[PDB]
């Protein structure tokens, strides 16, 4: 079996996806439905069974076995920027993280988590997975920071995979239950769907992202799993694109729409990064060596899923 955190969200139910496409079901899925509107993210997908975090969290730290377990994907996560509650972001992130490390290290269990490009912080370049590049700009980012660099003490005397990617822009199908956390071609095409403006925030064009869409994503986590490479790894398409460049491959497909900039929101800045490019030297060398939708690709993509 393989167990999927986060498996009721966005990178995770496409990993779930991602397995059931290699005719791999026998899985168990943890995470928190309190949103119940993410149940759709499973709904078309073949699973074995059903955890809440919490209940992991306690029988993981029992030592309970769930089975002949081939690989733990990481992805659960509170994944908002914009949360600032460190206890609550350093436990359910950072701890819970460490604690599902030392049982796949115990069982030699290959596990393969989430990381972010958040641990880059405010940066024009070099974007290279090593300590002196990674300065976050918010407690989210810290507690991804911090576990990569947990996971960097712990490398040398693993006796079984351990993979952390650090995911830039992600976009994509199964992401709906985000909120404000969602991509922003998912924004733009709400927005045009409800008859509004799609909305960019002020000073846009000098905005720039990694745009990684969520196939490729899941598809380079699967790869991982069967060649068995550790380490730490950007995952992104290594070209930076505007904002505008998103909302002009969605404007494109809806045949419509005039983007209106909107104030810069104030609890972002200051915790803000105005450009993220991967630097994929570290991934090829591992040998994952397959091409990355563009923007203009991914977002078409994506924009005829959503209609
Ligand atoms: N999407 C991106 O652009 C992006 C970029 C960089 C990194 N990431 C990381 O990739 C991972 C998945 O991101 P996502 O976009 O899929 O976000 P997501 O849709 O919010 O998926 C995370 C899911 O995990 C649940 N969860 C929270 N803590 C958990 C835990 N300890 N164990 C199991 N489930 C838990 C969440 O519920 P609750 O939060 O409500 O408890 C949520 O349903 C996260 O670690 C995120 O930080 C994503
Ligand atoms: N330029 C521009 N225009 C309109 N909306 C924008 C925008 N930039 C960002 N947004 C919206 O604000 C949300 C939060 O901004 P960020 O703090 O910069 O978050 P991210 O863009 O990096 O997206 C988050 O990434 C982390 C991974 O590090 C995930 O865990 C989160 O779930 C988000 O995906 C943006 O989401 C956007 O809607």
Redesign the pocket.
């Known amino acids: 079996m393989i167990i999927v ?9 496409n990993i779930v996806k991602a397995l059931n496409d290699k005719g791999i079901t026998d899985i168990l899925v ?6 119940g509107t ?1 149940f759709v993210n499973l709904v078309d997908l073949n699973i074995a069974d059903y955890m809440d ?1 919490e209940d ?2 306690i029988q993981i730290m029992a030592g309970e076995e769930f089975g002949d377990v081939e690989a733990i994907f ?7 920027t914009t949360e600032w509650d460190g206890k609550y972001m350093m436990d ?2 950072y701890q ?2 460490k604690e599902l490390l030392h049982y796949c290290l115990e069982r030699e269990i290959p596990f393969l ?6 641990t880059y912080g405010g940066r024009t370049s070099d974007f290279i997975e090593s300590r002196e590049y990674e300065k976050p700009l918010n407690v ?1 980012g810290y507690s ?1 920071f911090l576990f990569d660099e947990y996971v960097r003490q712990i490398l040398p005397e693993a006796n079984s995979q351990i993979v952390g990617f ?6 994509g199908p199964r ?1 709906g ?2 909120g404000s ?1 969602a ?1 922003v071609a998912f924004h733009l095409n709400t927005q045009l769907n409800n008859g509004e403006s799609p909305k960019l925030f002020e000073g846009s064009e000098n905005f720039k992202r990694d745009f990684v869409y ?1 196939g490729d994503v899941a598809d380079v986590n699967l790869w991982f799993l069967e060649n068995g490479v550790s380490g730490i790894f950007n995952l992104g398409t290594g070209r930076a694109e505007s904002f505008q460049a998103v909302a002009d491959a969605t404007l494109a497909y809806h045949k419509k729409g005039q983007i209106e900039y909107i104030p810069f929101p104030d609890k972002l800045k200051g915790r803000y990064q105005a450009f993220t490019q991967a630097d994929l030297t570290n991934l090829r060398a591992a040998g994952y060596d397959k091409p990355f939708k563009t923007v203009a690709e991914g977002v078409t993509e994506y924009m005829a899923w959503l209609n």
Do not use: Q, W
């Open positions: 955190t986060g498996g009721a969200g966005f990178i995770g139910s943890v995470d928190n439905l309190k949103d993410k975090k992991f969290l990481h992805e659960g996560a509170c994944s908002s359910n992130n819970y993280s988590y989430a990381s972010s490009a958040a989210f991804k650090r995911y830039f822009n992600v976009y992401e239950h985000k956390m991509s969520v």
